[PDB]
Amino acid sequence: DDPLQQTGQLFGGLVRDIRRRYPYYLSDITDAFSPQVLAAVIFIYFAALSPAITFGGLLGEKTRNQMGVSELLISTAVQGILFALLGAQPLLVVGFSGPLLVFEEAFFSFCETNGLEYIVGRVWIGFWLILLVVLVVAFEGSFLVRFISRYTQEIFSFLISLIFIYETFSKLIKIFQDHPLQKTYNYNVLMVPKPQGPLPNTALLSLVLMAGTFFFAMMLRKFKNSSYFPGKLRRVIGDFGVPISILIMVLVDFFIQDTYTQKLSVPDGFKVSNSSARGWVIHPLGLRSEFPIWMMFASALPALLVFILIFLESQITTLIVSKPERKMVKGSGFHLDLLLVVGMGGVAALFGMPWLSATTVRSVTHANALTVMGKAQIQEVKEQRISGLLVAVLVGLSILMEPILSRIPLAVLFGIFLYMGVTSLSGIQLFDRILLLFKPPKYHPDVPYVKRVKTWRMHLFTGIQIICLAVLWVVKSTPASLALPFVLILTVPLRRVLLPLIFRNVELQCLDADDA
Amino acid sequence: DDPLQQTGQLFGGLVRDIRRRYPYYLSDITDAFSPQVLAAVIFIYFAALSPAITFGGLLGEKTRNQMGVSELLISTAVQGILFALLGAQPLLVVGFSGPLLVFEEAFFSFCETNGLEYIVGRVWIGFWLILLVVLVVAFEGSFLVRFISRYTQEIFSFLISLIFIYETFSKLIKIFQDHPLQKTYNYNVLMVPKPQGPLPNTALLSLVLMAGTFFFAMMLRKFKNSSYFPGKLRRVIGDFGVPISILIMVLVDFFIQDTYTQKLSVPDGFKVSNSSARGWVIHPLGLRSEFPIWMMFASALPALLVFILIFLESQITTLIVSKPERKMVKGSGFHLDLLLVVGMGGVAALFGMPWLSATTVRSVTHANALTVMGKAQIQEVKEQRISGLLVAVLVGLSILMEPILSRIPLAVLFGIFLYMGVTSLSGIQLFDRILLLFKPPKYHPDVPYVKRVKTWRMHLFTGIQIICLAVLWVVKSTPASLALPFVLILTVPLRRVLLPLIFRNVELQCLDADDA
Numbered sequence A, B: 001d002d003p004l005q006q007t008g009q010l011f012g013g014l015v016r017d018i019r020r021r022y023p024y025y026l027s028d029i030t031d032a033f034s035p036q037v038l039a040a041v042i043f044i045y046f047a048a049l050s051p052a053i054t055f056g057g058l059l060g061e062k063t064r065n066q067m068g069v070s071e072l073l074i075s076t077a078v079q080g081i082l083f084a085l086l087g088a089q090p091l092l093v094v095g096f097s098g099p100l101l102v103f104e105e106a107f108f109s110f111c112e113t114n115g116l117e118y119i120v121g122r123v124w125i126g127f128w129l130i131l132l133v134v135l136v137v138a139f140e141g142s143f144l145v146r147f148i149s150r151y152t153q154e155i156f157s158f159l160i161s162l163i164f165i166y167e168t169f170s171k172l173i174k175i176f177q178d179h180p181l182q183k184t185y186n187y188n189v190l191m192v193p194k195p196q197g198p199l200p201n202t203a204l205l206s207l208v209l210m211a212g213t214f215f216f217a218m219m220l221r222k223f224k225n226s227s228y229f230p231g232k233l234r235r236v237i238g239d240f241g242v243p244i245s246i247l248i249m250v251l252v253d254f255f256i257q258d259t260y261t262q263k264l265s266v267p268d269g270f271k272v273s274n275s276s277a278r279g280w281v282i283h284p285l286g287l288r289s290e291f292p293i294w295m296m297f298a299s300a301l302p303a304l305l306v307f308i309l310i311f312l313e314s315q316i317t318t319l320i321v322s323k324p325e326r327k328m329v330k331g332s333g334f335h336l337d338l339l340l341v342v343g344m345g346g347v348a349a350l351f352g353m354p355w356l357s358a359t360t361v362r363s364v365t366h367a368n369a370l371t372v373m374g375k376a377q378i379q380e381v382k383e384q385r386i387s388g389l390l391v392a393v394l395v396g397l398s399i400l401m402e403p404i405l406s407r408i409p410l411a412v413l414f415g416i417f418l419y420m421g422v423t424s425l426s427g428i429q430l431f432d433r434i435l436l437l438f439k440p441p442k443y444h445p446d447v448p449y450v451k452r453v454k455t456w457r458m459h460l461f462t463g464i465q466i467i468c469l470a471v472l473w474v475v476k477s478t479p480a481s482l483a484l485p486f487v488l489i490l491t492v493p494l495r496r497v498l499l500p501l502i503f504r505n506v507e508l509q510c511l512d513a514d515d516a
């Protein structure tokens, strides 16, 4: 019955995933007919869009607009639509992550140094990724995901959430660096491409709009859980908590006419970011020069790195989202989700568009947005395809709705990203055990890993996971940032080999439990 | 045993107050030997000082510096020292209020129009106030305070707290009016007397410093009540919650060198605000011209208004602070506190210094700062004289410590005033019953006025008290602002005559309870 059981039949996992979820397909339309779904669509849209605008911007900077915002928005939309319809876990938000950006920047620098075309280089990586994922899904390689315990899951989940929060603050700090609090400013600053010098009030208003949006979001989260107003209205206001926080703080910025704040910019229409470099279809054999056969074969090694990058990112996100603690009854498919996400990425490369992955924060945020809460415990989860479908479509239609987005500050969305980052820590026993380091040992909750485990041994087990978070944080920073997925895999040996030397069996079963 | 019992002996109340509290005088020194007292001294100092600086500023503006900051600081200090030593309730913070400011502005305009000297006019009001309070304390007029129920007490307490919060926001809004968010500014702005035009970043940083100080204060309030850190450290950090909030946000402003924020300004030394107008001793018979005998006698009617103003302000503040719900075991004296506060005010007028009153928010704030909490319930209150003594001394020594105060923003203190205003609503059944209007009728607490009172009749009783708050708010704004104490007294008839026509006896006993 379990998803991560090795069947024996070639593509046995893929079919057993399709046989499981597609029976509840009519449910996946009708379960979306609630207002909490509509609220989630508006929330996850901005969570989905702004990274595509940002990473797209960076891609445009890093690769001389050979790939950019236009290409990433279109990829995010088409893969998002297809995955929402055909996927095993529609709650996964498919998009572009940092580790994928680090590879594009790395692969561009390679392609430059060796004097071989970059965008056609990615097509061949794409073909290898299609070859690998079919081979992996054929022999049910996603069974190995079962060995990835809560230990590795939470270290990953917690790290990703911390980095999200860090980068959200790094974005705010940057505004203060570009628009410092000076005594005097140049009243003449060209604003066509970007502010050409520091401006008054921009940095502090950015802080106020971020702080304000985060505050309101967290108060309407608290109001939802409170016992104020009629229950019907209390949920309607509460579920539309984030959309309401955005609307009012967007309106607050709109009425402030004189002060400048950075808004969401999108391309004018649907065209490639550099028309002189490429078209909509990338030629394998080459665009200008002859693409060499040495790299056509050698592209396997980059593709094997990209596979490991998408796989762990996506399969650990599928583990976190489809865990027994949450009320996911429809069922998850680790084989069909891997096949589409990695498969589409390969075909996306053929059109010069970026391959994507089930991103951890956006997926958790989207799942957490569709969870109805009782009392505190989770009653059920609104598992349906329409949230993801409509989000993916809106990202597609973001170019058409420029007049709407052009009056939405980034500062506002930075408040929502902070809310996303904080909220993502909720269902993580690592973060729970980190707060127990500060609580005295007579205020710890009545849980399995407190009653029949010694408090100093609990804290040692927590301490070892911090040392793993610390080591993983140093890697992502250093030039060995694409080696972080391999460092995270090394936490499986740590749990399976080393921890049972210092700890006993009973302690590890209670600390690292599959279901609690 | 009760304080508000009419004895029969002339000055029977005054002596029975002295006989009650002075036995516990050695306790009133030794009970101050805790860190929560030191924390309260630092907190209430800024709560005490900044109004004396502000109202002193306004007095300097309203009366051509015939009375100003110097005079008010010295009055606040000398009356504060004397009252801390000799008073019946040392928890009362004696200072200058708005209703007293409205009288000075009103009496100045009179004294101008009729062409009689203002500062000597106040001396004669002062003599009438000494005559009245002695007469009132002789025949134990403070017995009438017993008829002032929770009904009037809470309407007053709630109104004063709302106005405090409103005026705190009015102060912030004014910074945005003087330093608007413009596209362009004049890089040349003389700053000697005050900014001579709008400046960039001042208004938003003011908002950030206010919001920041309020946030930190409310989080260290929450941290105190939480179950984090060792209990010893948890209280030390919690009880120094407001001082810590001020220190860090003062340091945050200190490291920002380029941006301008308004700081606490004090006089250079101890001299009268206008030396050409007056000296340190005001002559009854006159300074320049002959003071007419018509007003020497007619000053009774202004003095009778000032008496009613100080009495209700101070005696209702003594009721609110020394209520049975709180753990005030040392005992309060309504006769001795009235004698000193009004008496000193009369003698203060002879030196050209403003008469004061037991102010509601500062007194409650000071009382709330010295309450130790259990678990949620109040264990005891740190009733001692040293808090009030040291606060009064620090206000006296504020002129000497200009270098310390000159680097404290007002924006920071605006965050503390917001914290004071919110925190003052805690022990008010009116505010509690206001929140029940929004809560559904199956989430109301298990209290006497919910179980055996119909929910629609509770809300009607709450509604009638809002209409009183509304009527009182209109009076404070209109030119009949000195008629507000009389409008508040009319809420006694309302409770004693009108409410028992629409309500039953049992309902009023449960809604308006002396002890709950």
Ligand SMILES: CCCCCCCCCCCCCCCCCC(=O)OC[C@H](COP(=O)([O-])OCC[N+](C)(C)C)OC(=O)CCCCCCCCCCCCCCCCC
Pocket: A208, A211, A212, A215, A252, A255, A256, B172, B173, B176, B177, B178, B180, B181, B207, B210, B211, B214, B215, B218, B422
């Ligand atoms: C735990 C609580 C922590 C607080 C978190 C809050 C984060 C910060 C968010 C602030 C709200 C956003 C304000 C936008 C800035 C306004 C700019 C503007 O144009 O306004 C100009 C206006 C008026 O100025 P004006 O420029 O229009 O005036 C005209 C100008 N002349 C005269 C030149 C023509 O000012 C304001 O609106 C006042 C300031 C903003 C509102 C204050 C918000 C409250 C913040 C205080 C702390 C929190 C309060 C908590 C209370 C409840 C208890 C929980």
Ligand SMILES: CCCCCCCCCCCCCCCCCC(=O)OC[C@H](COP(=O)([O-])OCC[N+](C)(C)C)OC(=O)CCCCCCCCCCCCCCCCC
Pocket: A172, A173, A176, A177, A178, A180, A181, A207, A210, A211, A214, A215, A218, A418, A422, B208, B211, B212, B215, B252, B256
């Ligand atoms: C309930 C949640 C509500 C929280 C909001 C509370 C009210 C708002 C308080 C805001 C904090 C103000 C402190 C910063 C003051 C400005 C600093 C400045 O100007 O210095 C310049 C510095 C920048 O350094 P710099 O200017 O020296 O850089 C050099 C410049 N050049 C390159 C030109 C030479 O500013 C900063 O440090 C960045 C801003 C810090 C902001 C702090 C984070 C607050 C985020 C919003 C609120 C949400 C947080 C919640 C997190 C916890 C979860 C509960």
Ligand SMILES: */C(=S)=N/C1=[C]C(S([O])(=O)=O)=C(/[C]=[C]/C2=C(S([O])(=O)=O)[C]=C(N=C=S)[C]=[C]2)[C]=[C]1
Pocket: A050, A051, A054, A055, A097, A098, A099, A102, A160, A163, A164, A167, A168, A171, A313, A476, A477, A481, A484, A485
């Ligand atoms: C914003 S949007 N800015 C932003 C956000 C992210 S995010 O949301 O993907 O965390 C990043 C990427 C940071 C990151 C790295 S990187 O780029 O520092 O090497 C590595 C990993 N490792 C893994 S798995 C995670 C995140 C940048 C900018």
Ligand SMILES: */C(=S)=N\C1=[C]C(S([O])(=O)=O)=C(/[C]=[C]/C2=C(S([O])(=O)=O)[C]=C(N=C=S)[C]=[C]2)[C]=[C]1
Pocket: B050, B051, B054, B055, B097, B098, B099, B101, B102, B160, B163, B164, B165, B167, B171, B313, B476, B477, B481, B484, B485
């Ligand atoms: C600042 S600090 N300045 C300030 C402070 C206050 S207060 O007293 O709330 O700290 C006020 C409000 C004065 C006030 C009035 S008045 O003068 O505005 O009519 C009336 C009443 N009603 C009664 S009793 C109380 C206070 C203004 C400015």
Ligand SMILES: *[C@@H]1O[C@H](CO)[C@@H](O[C@@H]2O[C@H](CO)[C@@H](O)[C@H](O)[C@H]2NC(C)=O)[C@H](O)[C@H]1NC(C)=O
Pocket: A063, A064, A065, A066, A273, A274, A276, A277
């Ligand atoms: C479009 O792509 C081409 C190729 O990178 C860029 O054209 C080159 O620009 C670089 C830097 O100036 C120089 O090598 C030459 O000017 C061009 N030669 C090449 C390699 O084509 C162009 O900069 C790109 N434009 C965008 C939109 O990024």
Ligand SMILES: *[C@@H]1O[C@H](CO)[C@@H](O[C@@H]2O[C@H](CO)[C@@H](O)[C@H](O)[C@H]2NC(C)=O)[C@H](O)[C@H]1NC(C)=O
Pocket: B063, B064, B065, B066, B273, B274, B276, B277
């Ligand atoms: C000091 O007090 C005197 C009296 O108010 C002020 O001097 C007068 O100013 C008023 C208003 O302009 C006019 O009557 C004359 O200009 C002055 N004659 C007097 C003595 O009345 C003086 O402005 C005050 N200074 C301060 C510090 O406020």
Ligand SMILES: CC(C)CCC[C@@H](C)[C@H]1CC[C@H]2[C@@H]3CC=C4C[C@@H](O)CC[C@]4(C)[C@H]3CC[C@]12C
Pocket: A035, A042, A236, A240, A243, A244, A246, A247, A250, A404, A408
């Ligand atoms: C683009 C920026 C300005 C943010 C946009 C957010 C908008 C679309 C959000 C904010 C508040 C939202 C509304 C809040 C509450 C309800 C009641 C519900 O029964 C139907 C939907 C409805 C009527 C929502 C529709 C969408 C809404 C208007």
Ligand SMILES: CC(C)CCC[C@@H](C)[C@H]1CC[C@H]2[C@@H]3CC=C4C[C@@H](O)CC[C@]4(C)[C@H]3CC[C@]12C
Pocket: A010, A011, A014, A015, A130, A134, A339, A340, A343, A344
């Ligand atoms: C482009 C990428 C994403 C997909 C390429 C197509 C290949 C690899 C996949 C797509 C769906 C797959 C099929 C799905 C279901 C079955 C039924 C099973 O009883 C035998 C295998 C078989 C017939 C699979 C064979 C391989 C298959 C055809």
Ligand SMILES: CC(C)CCC[C@@H](C)[C@H]1CC[C@H]2[C@@H]3CC=C4C[C@@H](O)CC[C@]4(C)[C@H]3CC[C@]12C
Pocket: A074, A077, A078, A081, A270, A271, A280, A393, A396, A397
């Ligand atoms: C499901 C429905 C609503 C579609 C949603 C996605 C839409 C908005 C997006 C996804 C990808 C987009 C296409 C991408 C590329 C091109 C080629 C260009 O030469 C003309 C526009 C065209 C054809 C775009 C039109 C809009 C498009 C079809």
Ligand SMILES: CC(C)CCC[C@@H](C)[C@H]1CC[C@H]2[C@@H]3CC=C4C[C@@H](O)CC[C@]4(C)[C@H]3CC[C@]12C
Pocket: A437, A455, A456, A457, A459, A460, A463, A464, A466, A467, A470
């Ligand atoms: C090695 C360092 C630099 C890594 C940084 C993480 C720090 C904060 C971690 C690593 C090891 C951890 C310690 C490991 C073991 C114990 C014993 C326990 O009874 C109390 C907590 C305590 C004392 C931990 C506190 C947190 C700790 C000090």
Ligand SMILES: CC(C)CCC[C@@H](C)[C@H]1CC[C@H]2[C@@H]3CC=C4C[C@@H](O)CC[C@]4(C)[C@H]3CC[C@]12C
Pocket: B035, B042, B236, B240, B243, B244, B246, B247, B250, B404, B408
């Ligand atoms: C004037 C501005 C900068 C604010 C001044 C606040 C200062 C005086 C406050 C803020 C934090 C305070 C400290 C916080 C904690 C303690 C521990 C206690 O066991 C003794 C007092 C002591 C050491 C306090 C002394 C006073 C203190 C330093």
Ligand SMILES: CC(C)CCC[C@@H](C)[C@H]1CC[C@H]2[C@@H]3CC=C4C[C@@H](O)CC[C@]4(C)[C@H]3CC[C@]12C
Pocket: B010, B011, B015, B130, B133, B134, B339, B340, B343, B344
């Ligand atoms: C500050 C101003 C008002 C103080 C002066 C007011 C005068 C009238 C007050 C101050 C102290 C008072 C005395 C204090 C104590 C006693 C003892 C008692 O057994 C009889 C009354 C008697 C003798 C009081 C009479 C009134 C009194 C003399």
Ligand SMILES: CC(C)CCC[C@@H](C)[C@H]1CC[C@H]2[C@@H]3CC=C4C[C@@H](O)CC[C@]4(C)[C@H]3CC[C@]12C
Pocket: B074, B077, B078, B081, B270, B271, B280, B393, B396, B397
């Ligand atoms: C209890 C101790 C610490 C005293 C505290 C209050 C001190 C700081 C204040 C209160 C009133 C003040 C006095 C008020 C008036 C004058 C007259 C002037 O011509 C010289 C200064 C002098 C004499 C002041 C000196 C400082 C002073 C004495």
Ligand SMILES: CC(C)CCC[C@@H](C)[C@H]1CC[C@H]2[C@@H]3CC=C4C[C@@H](O)CC[C@]4(C)[C@H]3CC[C@]12C
Pocket: B437, B455, B456, B457, B459, B460, B462, B463, B464, B466, B467, B470
């Ligand atoms: C200045 C204005 C606000 C003065 C009027 C005060 C308002 C808030 C008061 C006056 C009478 C009150 C109503 C009296 C009775 C009831 C019935 C109860 O089952 C629900 C609340 C409700 C409907 C009250 C709501 C609040 C109310 C409307």
